[model samples]
Target chain A: CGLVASNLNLKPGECLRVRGEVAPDAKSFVLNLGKDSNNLCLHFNPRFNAHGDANTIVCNSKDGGAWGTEQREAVFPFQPGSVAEVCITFDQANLTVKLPDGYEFKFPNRLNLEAINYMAADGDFKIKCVAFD
Target chain B: CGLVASNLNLKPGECLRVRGEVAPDAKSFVLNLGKDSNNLCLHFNPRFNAHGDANTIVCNSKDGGAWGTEQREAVFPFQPGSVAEVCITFDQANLTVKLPDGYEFKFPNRLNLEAINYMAADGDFKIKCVAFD
Candidate 1:
């Protein structure tokens, strides 16, 4: 949140769990892992109201500062002011996300990276805890 | 070895466990939590060769890049090539480190900060796992 590295050097087989409380007036937020702003191995974003969809998640990646096709997932399980958790696990070819509502989703690790040392998160959120295992 | 953040976020009552196999021919390694390389709140370092002591654990802190006095203990449980575990617990005024050798030591949290988001690790090491609870 302070232009700081939020987690360890991300690696294959590493799982990250983020637990937080969403601000009551929250709009949107994104969690990303990559080398920097221009390169992301994983981009997870939840939009409260976007593209005419009230609840949706858009997943994508950026390479060399170019945007890729956005992968969308329905079934958002979060609400304003509610506490929730998000777990992300990475492997050679894919990044899997386990949502708090027991929903499982995924996106291709198009970057084909094994270790991502940069992480960024923002939006109306108060992080309660985070775990990497 | 340089400056790096190792965990998602650190909070009060949090327990951190670092698992790794010490490099063969390793000299020493340390896992720390603080604000930055210069503003370390907890400096948990082990010197395999120091002060005529085979194994010494030095604990201290740094404020505004100014280092405080060092605290030392004599007990070595890590082997150069063997894997080991170290656990750290944080609270308001004290930091307790459970050494790999089952020895636990404490250092005052002089900074008395609520949450330290900066982490750094160095020395001969290959990180295998890091968990926050």
Candidate 2:
């Protein structure tokens, strides 16, 4: 079964919060948005270890064709055995990702908001809820 | 060799124009900007056909973990047998991509510009020039 049952639309100045639980044995997971099965998108792999941390945050578009300007270790710490919450705030010019622990990562929206409208998740986990406001 | 010799930075209210030629037999091509080798980025595949058009533009972040609010068909037309120019304009809140033929695709910059600094291209192609002012 697919993790997303419907499509979500966001305007220029809107935000969304995705909160969920990671299976104890799950090593990594991914969330996708766009038309193709694999193109223009983002990824969140908890097993991405940088500086001795398992939580890694990455942003990509068109498989790195016309990539964004920023990529680095996410400030947020993902606890292996607990619920995790990540907030994506859409500002006028960029998207600000805030982790539960106050860590942040930012990336440019290469494509404007006018041409986007879908979301999906794949991995060994369960989503508690996703809210957009 | 790396297509970009240095990092190009864009402010909240700035824009950049990337113009180059597409190899005649090149099946696909990608342009990347970010820190990771293959994490957060974008892809431009001229072979992606939708509505009988061979140009596709996609956007992704954090491996699609905290997905964006929109994803759909890009209106820009990418011709395989000619020099293609795509302009990325950064507004106060979003990024607008305008194609040479007047087709447009928009996506929210999930991450802010303060954290971006890299650009790359791969796949049987040559970049004539990339300018930001």
Candidate 3:
């Protein structure tokens, strides 16, 4: 997950789809959308046993390297050694995330950015495919 | 052009499309695809007057911070401040680039790696849209 795709044109009215397989002994995996590494607008993370949490999904944002209040999602449908899919779309107000298990959630677009050009994933996820349209 | 997309799954049989407008006072713009910044497999550069080249497209590769021999193409169809588009597809052997003016060229897959996880652009270009499929 060290590689970075830079100088992009990720704008509104676009959807980003990501598919990956969670590790058998997965602890956590994070998906971030932002202007860069330090100015993330949406930090979507799922934890299996990391950060003192068990099977909980935590969402947050960052500005100038400062993290905002963490939002916890009680619904967790991820299983170890299983394929996971997530579709993300955003506008000026909120970012909508649809999970693989027919569940969806919304998070505020705190940054209120027009063009999002950064994204990354880390920790126990083996990425299979990623597409932007 | 400061953002970076990371943790990607860019593989063979996939195509990456980039569309942008060159700056009105542009000197050069570069598009890089690689495992990372320092191990680039394709360094596609279009120079109007930069690096002592005038309206030439230069292609090269880098490994461990060292660059290979540069390949120069004279088929320059770019206009300053005009929209530019390029489509890139690759295999284990070579990367095929199709230019906007119906010109095409090939560059060697010097890195010979399986997954390309990094992409970036710099200099006098304003990106409009980028997509992968």
Candidate 4:
């Protein structure tokens, strides 16, 4: 597993795009968007067999190290040893994600923040590119 | 004075664009691009009255806290109390700057880095927008 954290300072209406290759034996990968790690507004996790979940994409939020309700989507299109792309657009009400298979998933903006100053990627993946706009 | 540092991780052929309003009574402002503060590939400083530089734009590189020869530009189009835009395109050989006045300036990529992982803005400027593409 690899981890990369950055001061992204992503604001509403901006989009963060991530492309990476899944590990051949990936268990999961988590992407965190928030003011900080402990106060994540969005914790996007795609799991293959971790946390008692298989082929599930779980999205959640956290506040002061306390996690919120988990939202699960089963439309997984990721394949091991292949590249996957995800695009996330944030707003006051929702964070919309365009998954690799072109499925659009919406997660509520529980923190309702104007901007998220931190972004981090962790777990079984190899980052190929990250872009902001 | 204000300062913001980010993990930009800008790669070659990418453009880092910055837009900000200059402080009305500004002394100077510096934008740094490098792996970290101690090893800068580009030090872009626009001065009104700082470092014995007035209405001058200074560009330099640093390694291990040691400074390189300063390259000064006399074509300063930045005005205090007005918005200014700068676009920097990075390459293995050069870091090209597009000034607010539509002038282009080239600085040698002394480090010849494939990517720069850090970006910082300091001094008399109010950042309005920053984008990487």
Candidate 5:
């Protein structure tokens, strides 16, 4: 999977939708968000390696220099060719990532959204489509 | 777009690819990575709004509770139902996001990748597929 970003203006607390497909030979994939000023900010990524089975979500942050904290797992399923959706509610305290399948993932808004203006994705997987509402 | 992560062990300076599609009504989307310990860590997102036009990538990081950095735009295109790829190289200083189309978005690895273990996705859009090699 790979990372992609949009040039649309996103406010804190608003949600967007991302639709895409998985490669047949793909074992698992992840999605990530970038930070302001620096594009090298920590991002998010969803995991799908079950082969039509259950999947999970993980988050990364910067503590010292490299990404701090271990990957947090979420409840979700990544079925190939299946339509998957997630809702992100950016609040003052954290960024909540919600899945259609009742799975939820949260990340701290270490950086105020007031400065951020774009979005991005990166991984070893392939994406077909991505858009915000 | 949504945030998705993988459970696969990733090393610094390594690259991964993401593949998938965009919804018919998708205007723009973003991808993000998660933080460890607290899933609320700031993530990354890519923007795609133009119809069959050029797209860009952005980054979001937390500086003081809310996402700090401004969306760092990248050079790329998000075409509906088109295959997109990105290479994430985790370095000691930053996480470099490389797109298959030659776009690069970087974000600080604020947190260490030691404690992280899962991936996730959340947005107003839908994803067709997500997997890692």
Candidate 6:
């Protein structure tokens, strides 16, 4: 899957909101924030066709083009072919995420950077809009 | 409706996440963060059957058990009988909120307290889960 990169540097107290729709037969989707196209401070992936009964959300980071531990949350919140909204908030330690259905989770910012200037999202979905403020 | 209590003490980087459901005949719901049940630093209320066509969200503060001016936002994000999610993040100056529908807003912490150890939810709804750190 190709990535959608942005020039938005998400800071503390600021929120990054993304809205899109899941494909009818979608397998997964990933939202990311980092320094550039290859170094991701937060790698958020929600797997609909993963090793789970319903769904699983995996969170990780990519530093220097190398991936880190994959944190997984099985709290499924999306369905096929439906419009979805997501909120990702950042801090000094973690990125707090809220799915469209309001399910909440957190992903540690192992990169531990003060701010992430790049944003990208790619997978089996269509992005409608993105706002980082 | 009774408010749910927890031993959570919210710090600057802490986000308080709450999950619940809107009653089928619900008119509104509120989420509060304060030093105690009677003194709310962040009084958040979403009115469904309010003076709006969709919904109206109101925010205020209660210092010395006295509620201040009401701040209203018409970005209604909940429907009757549907389960919902909410995240309230704290800073030195304001309380940031992300609604279940991924709509985000902010309310001022007029009291400007260092920490809010109390949280409560009331009106037409059921509490599913709550976490603060």
Structural similarity to truth (TM-score) of each candidate: 0.71, 0.42, 0.65, 0.63, 0.42, 0.48
Question: Model 1 chain A: which ten-residue window has the lowest total lDDT?
Answer: A1-10
Residue range A9-58, candidate 6, lDDT tens digits: 45687887777779999888877788775788788888888656347778
lDDT of each: 0.75, 0.54, 0.82, 0.81, 0.52, 0.74
Q: Which candidate leads the pack in lDDT?
A: 3
Q: Write the per-residue lDDT of candidate 5 for residues A25-77, one digit (tens) a residue.
A: 55556555545314422356566654353465556764334665646664555
Model 4, range A1-133, lDDT digits (tens) per residue? 2434445667788887777779898899888888887888889999999989989999999999999999998689887788888888889899998987678888999988888777677788665556566
Docking class of 1: incorrect
Compared with the true structure, what per-residue lDDT tens digits does model 2 show for residues B1-133?
3253222434445555666777777566666543333433333434444334455555554443443433445454665657877766654445566777777776666554343345556654456545454
Interface RMSD of 5: 9.4
Residue A30 of model 4 has an lDDT of 85
Per-residue lDDT of B35 in model 4: 82
Clashes in model 4: which pairs? Answer: none
The residue ranges of model 4 lying beyond 4 angstroms of the native Cα positions read A1-31, A44-57, A62-69, A72-116, A121-133, B1-9
Candidate 3, residue A108: the lDDT equals: 90
Docking class of 3: acceptable
TM-score of chain A in every predicted structure: 0.89, 0.73, 0.93, 0.93, 0.69, 0.89
Q: Taking the tens digit of each residue's C-alpha lDDT, what string does model 2 give over A13-132?
A: 656566778776756666655434444444444554434646665556544355444365645476655787776655445666677777777666555445234456667545554555
TM-score of chain B of each: 0.88, 0.71, 0.94, 0.93, 0.65, 0.90
Error of 1 at A2 (Å): 8.7
